[PDB]
């Protein structure tokens, strides 16, 4: 138990963490696995939570003692998976059973340093959905009875993982969209670390392969004379999604100049072009424009304006943008680059995915600490940006 | 079970139906409960009668005499729960089938709990019908939850006049449907959530006669197609300005995924060029406005599914292949630009 | 090994799989107003001639039923009428008269200690069929789908707004086939059977009526049979008009492109009006061929046969692609008195064809139009 | 109690009914008020069920003894209403109380020949919504204990009157749309009469005034040189609604010929015009067309086609239609007049509202008995109709 | 009560607020439960404080000191249920106010049942606040269910800096808003279900300068307006072919009822003609395509409502008047054609 204490006399944490060979997974947990703690991994079914936990477990079995409890898959099924992933000549125990009373008995017997519950939805107890909240409460008290690290898996369902977020020590989300081949592990709530930490992984035939240096993916993905491509750090609620805007500006041949968007609001693009013609001075009147959000990402947020203006200008001008620079900003009809919400989160996320510059609205920076790995350029007008970029 | 070390972990009854065996993960395990779900009329009784005649069948849904007429077209096959339990102890049957488990519906949950304990009392395989396997429309049987196998396994059948006939080569469905060198058809390995669906994109490019060039799609997003054509004209060099274009997703499949772009581009080009594509080659890839063929999700599943359905080539994005094992039965061609693809294809 | 009771109505017998099986529960479902009471009064006045009928219902009064049932049949025979509701008062009369056939005119209007409880009453009715070995008919107004799994035979009396046919189909039959149908037409007297339905399709058609064609489409699993209508006429004005009602506009637009590019019809300068007769929505790939044939029929000014129908998705290469549920569609066409049916040739692999209909497998649109015109 | 009886020996009804001064209300009940019976009056709130029952009650109090039970309005409120409506120097008893036990006691005391429950929703009992089904069951048994006629009121709500329809003797519906100034009382289920019977009433400042001779309303409503007006007997589910289609065909002055509909599907009208031009021979190519469903009635049923074709033709031709003739029929693209559902109900409803002709599809008439008060003309083609009409 | 013969059926506390008295059907009856409903912020506490200072106020929602500051701007006025009941027997107050009745919400139903029995124990008038009268947005107080009065009664108030000020002549709201002979404005007595709303239709007819004539509506159905103009051109004889038309429902009232046709026709004509309408005259009537002014529902209510809000004329359809008593304060003009109306109006 803990006691009310004066803040000046609150002593700094002196924990002993357990690191895994996966540098990324360690950063996320804020150094490594803290013993006597409850970590929830959330995400859509199929993303690879079981796969990530099997990989962590085969690594942790080398220094501690792992008990992997799954009601979801059978014991034989896991053996076929886990041999591809790692080495299991070590103290890694597997238990394909679902009732907590039958689990508790095995925790006292083998006394395992690390416990993994593959699918909390598939664990029962007296008194498969409501009763998840009561099982996780009993699991947090179980972390103190035996002083063990416990991992909980939460599949994110259509209706009835976000419920347990407030009552666990660490909350991780494993998310990886149809458009990206890569899956990201983010800390939403961390009691033993920072929440701005991220771990990038790519699922390959073996299992999850870490992506240290992601700046190389964006550079491989760009062609030689790329032009009309630009990058925006947008938001899907609170998740900062990083997206590519594409533009093909080409002179009209026919009567009417064509305008066609996919993934961006058409009218938003129409205004952007008016502001580029009237403020930036681009003769777009007689130019066709095709615009696309790469990936099929819907881009419906004011912050995407600057990236789309830069994309268009890049195609019009036939001058490429840098693939490690990105742009954030609402564009006003006077050419101004207006403020946007969550600027600190967007700059953080850009830096972590290996970006070197980020153009942001100048007003958004008032008293914000900037990460040393990325050049934050505050801009005020569209002319200023295009001058800087081209 | 008790917990067990992973260094210390490791037989079934097969039927003549190779497909049904794969789904159950090798064959029928003697001590479990298998649920077959699906819409009424699909053939869950028909499939279970066929498995049973190969391998105690209990039905309230149809009469005894009705089943005899069915099952002859399709040995020790024997045809409420208290009256059933008494016959399970007497005959001691290795396989038990309950044709329709269906306040009975509130009691259905309590009957299946008692059936799982019955599988342990007398070590028997028990099949339950629910109007975890799912039989849904060719016809497909897929494993949603499998304790003794993989969930990615699928069994393709076709209901005929006799009963359900298994399907080995589903490539021959598109090949019969292909006419004598018919242009503007192409194939994509798309996804309906996680199920990889294989679909045909169709294009009719023809010169405009009057005034404005027409563009009409059915099953594909119109604007997606519009951009594809701009990229084919500006990057690939096809003069499509004065050409009408009609596009169709064969089957009435909705194709709303970035991966379909390349197949649509190839379809259009094929019709424009009047040069056909191969019916055993398929295409997967998002097409960028620079002509690039961008990466797509679930590439390993798509290549797997193409190979299994008897395809010989598959054009994929080149970047997607990093450290992925390729099946020996299919030629995976990684491409980077649309020009590269059309050069290879035509 | 069974002894059934036939009625004078050939159709109603086929549906039950030969006739009325004694000691059985038959549920007749449908909307209110279709004629379940009327059909059961007609069967009862016929069955009273060989057995003993007890007609129970509280939905209508005794005096009301007498006025109805004299128009329908003869009532000098052992036909007993009982306008009561609660069960216990019914059971007492079943033991007394010992009737071979029992009819309950609305299960919704019967009580035992009146919808939830309906499930418990029908359970007690099925055990009543064993105690006395009698055939019992139950009526279920559709507001019926709850009792379908716990009765011996399930019949549905259905009638879409466009056809004045009233079709009786067996959804679940323990003593017969489920494919069986009984076609009736409600007239001023009551329900008149339609034994030759082939003659009805051959009144709805005019003399020189081009641009009409028939498709066997599907409303889920029910195969609906529908008429596609086309009016192709040369444009007078600048732009050629295209207007659909009941079909997807873009689907029709592609069909016309395929007819011009593959079949060779000069439709560029022709206006086209298309309609699904009845206000049936036709949103299924299978309707393509019928719409193509309709248009061609109007363009060509050559009529189609009214007893021929067409099923098939039309590819942009002119091909006639496969469609789902082909065996059900052929079966439904045959039963409504059709003589030909054009289907996709690939759909026929190992399917047994009914002897009453000519199934023509086709592969291209050119082939079809050649055959048709 | 009643007994199983052979149909040949079932004797004809020999009842004694009570008539009211309102000829229409009597017809609906099939002659008059049957004693020892349960009659349900349904309809939207505000239509005038209380008003109709107060009028019936003040008339029935002259020959029997009425007990009007209302939980909905107070006793004093009803007195102010009922003096405008009729005479109450007679045995008319008012009881503003809601519990059935307290009601039962007063039924045994005064022994009233007629009982009215103003709002069954506002009557309570042990064991305001579920329990309506149990109260009406107890009311049907109460009709046999004392042999009295009982009227039940059912307000038709958004969600939770149509529930009691199967367990009462007579079901009446009082309906009267925003477009008609008149309210109609129809028998949906009648154990002591025909269901095709109808009673037309018009709510005036005093209360409900009966409309005997409705043929005069349609004739007053038409102007002198009316043209382009026609009448259709459409259906709103099962209720046959009678509606007026309006057309204004006038030559185009400008470039494009205008087409504008309100209440009819535009495309349906477009096809109708094509069939009139191609089959009937009307030169509508260079004519503007404005079409309106009078009342704001949505007309979305195939049967409305013929009425719209006749409306247009009437305006084009500048020849009026008869205001006591109406038209029913789907129009095929070959000019044919196709069959429609519920033809017998439509012909009935037309006749009852004082129509003299009705053009129907010829095929729809096979073995249907036609009412003697209306001329049913079966037609086969649009040309045939326009020939007959003009 | 016991049943009683109708030949044998037949006083209240009034407040200075004439409107509030009408709503309760004369005044406050001493032995009943009155519920005031509405959205938070509307002024149910403010209205009850004003009635109370004119006529025991119980509030958990606001403190005693807070109410004193409010109620002075706006005598024997005194400021859980067991602690309340004890004070009801002591002071014996003629009027009790519960400011906010608000598992309390499950118990709310049980508290109000005990409050209705409390009205009989001590014959007192009790007001209940629910975050049957409804206070909704000028501001209106309407009686939904009244046991001691009519439900068609309404009380109009306007919240000002002091508190709620009653409104006598709501005609003066449109009259202040009317400029010096402003054309193209007209008034309709429309209906929002059963509530007769009174609304202003606005039109700007102006000659087209280029190519196509514009038509733009806000609050009225576009097509309805389009037909009205065709009828004004073909029947009334207004050359609107080459005129642009902008139409607006003032307030953002949706006007989707046939009765609004005549007001819109008169509005357009007024703008076309550049002749104003009277601001105390209003118009009700569906307009047929022959120029006829057809009947409308609820005519008696509409005429009543117009008169009460200080209107002097009302143009109604002539057929609608058959056997209806007309109020002496308003000139009801029955019309039959649109030409007749425009002749009378201009
Ligand atoms: C480890 C591994 C998994 N898989 C498949 C099997 C799994 O069911 C699927 C999804 O991974 P999984 O980790 O089970 O997803 P979840 O996030 O729902 O726990 O990936 C392979 O195909 N190959 C492999 O080597
Ligand atoms: C076996 C068989 C079935 N059928 C028909 C009868 C069945 O009602 C229908 C559907 O098959 P069934 O297996 O009964 O469907 P389910 O159990 O999924 O509801 O197929 C045939 O026509 N011929 C056959 O040979
Ligand atoms: C027998 C008969 C019925 N009818 C009417 C009376 C019935 O109430 C109506 C509808 O038939 P009914 O069989 O009662 O419909 P269901 O029982 O399916 O709801 O048909 C006639 O008009 N004439 C007749 O000769
Ligand atoms: C009798 C009468 C009613 N009314 C009003 C008061 C009623 O609340 C209203 C509606 O009639 P009512 O009969 O109460 O409608 P419901 O169908 O809901 O029972 O008509 C008058 O204005 N004047 C009258 O003379
Ligand atoms: C009486 C009064 C209220 N108010 C404000 C304070 C209240 O919070 C607000 C709303 O009135 P109130 O009657 O409290 O709203 P309700 O009871 O309907 O929720 O009006 C003033 O600003 N000045 C005043 O003189
Ligand atoms: Mg998993
Ligand atoms: Mg079955
Ligand atoms: Mg009936
Ligand atoms: Mg009332
Ligand atoms: Mg308040």
Residue numbers in the entry:
A (entry chain A), D (entry chain A): 53 to 179, 186 to 218, 223 to 452
B (entry chain B), E (entry chain B): 54 to 63, 68 to 112, 119 to 137, 142 to 146, 151 to 173, 185 to 213, 233 to 238, 244 to 452
C (entry chain C): 66 to 178, 186 to 215, 223 to 452
Source paper text:
We report here a detailed structural and functional analysis of the RadA protein from S. pneumoniae, which uncovers several key properties of this HR effector encoded in nearly all bacterial species and in some eukaryotes. All bacterial RadA proteins are characterized at the sequence level by three conserved domains: a potential C4-type zinc binding motif (C4); a central canonical RecA-like ATPase domain (H), including a KNRFG motif unique to and strictly conserved in RadA proteins; and a region homologous to the protease domain (P) of the bacterial Lon protein. In addition, like DnaB proteins, we show that RadA assembles into a ring-shaped hexamer and is a functional DNA helicase that loads onto ssDNA and translocates in a 3′ direction along it to unwind dsDNA. The full-length protein (RadAFL) and the P domain (RadAP) of pneumococcal RadA were purified from E. coli and shown to assemble predominantly as hexamers in solution.
The crystal structure of RadAP was solved at 2.5 Å resolution and the structure of RadAFL bound to thymidine diphosphate (dTDP) was solved at 3.5 Å resolution. The structure of RadAFL reveals three protomers per asymmetric unit, organized as annular hexameric particles with two-fold symmetry and forming a two-tiered planar ring, corresponding to the H and P domains. The C4 domain (residues 1–35), present but unresolved in the crystal structure, likely occupies the gap observed in the crystal packing and is a functional zinc finger. The central H domain and the clasp in the RadAFL structure (residues 53–274) forms a ring with two-fold symmetry, with outer and inner diameters of 100 and 25 Å, respectively. It displays a typical RecA-fold containing a nucleotide-binding site and it is, most likely, the functional core. The position and dynamics of the H domain are different in each protomer of the asymmetric unit regardless of the nucleotide bound. In the RadAFL structure obtained upon crystallization in the presence of dTTP, each protomer was occupied by a hydrolysed dTDP. The nucleotide binding site displays all the canonical residues found in an ATPase active site of the RecA ATPase family. However, no arginine finger, required for nucleotide hydrolysis was found close to this site. In the RadA crystal structure, R253 is located further away from the ATPase active site of the neighbouring protomer (11 Å) than the corresponding residue in DnaB helicases.
